[PDB]
């Protein structure tokens, strides 16, 4: 979909494999959704493997902390 290039590139930077990337894209997640809206429970429901889930959530959490910290 339009704007998935930004999402796909960021997912690959967190070490996501092609099948995982397909799953996330098929749900119509945007990068905005991942950075701002998703919960860890969304990632578990997607059946993400632990390594990627750990990495991805650590990236999302640091982004959110920085935004909130910067106020």
Curated annotation (Swiss-Prot):
It comes from the Eukaryota. Isoform 2 and isoform 3 are widely expressed. Isoform 2 highest levels are observed in fetal brain, and isoform 3 highest levels in pancreas, peripheral blood leukocytes, fetal brain and spleen. Serine/threonine kinase which acts as a component of the MAP kinase signal transduction pathway. Once activated, acts as an upstream activator of the p38 MAPK signal transduction cascade through the phosphorylation and activation of several MAP kinase kinases. May function in a signal transduction pathway that is activated by various cell stresses and leads to apoptosis. Involved in phosphorylation of WNK4 in response to osmotic stress or hypotonic low-chloride stimulation via the p38 MAPK signal transduction cascade. Belongs to the protein kinase superfamily. STE Ser/Thr protein kinase family. MAP kinase kinase kinase subfamily. This is Mitogen-activated protein kinase kinase kinase 15. It comes from Homo sapiens (Human). The chain holds residues 1241 to 1308 of 1313 of the full protein.
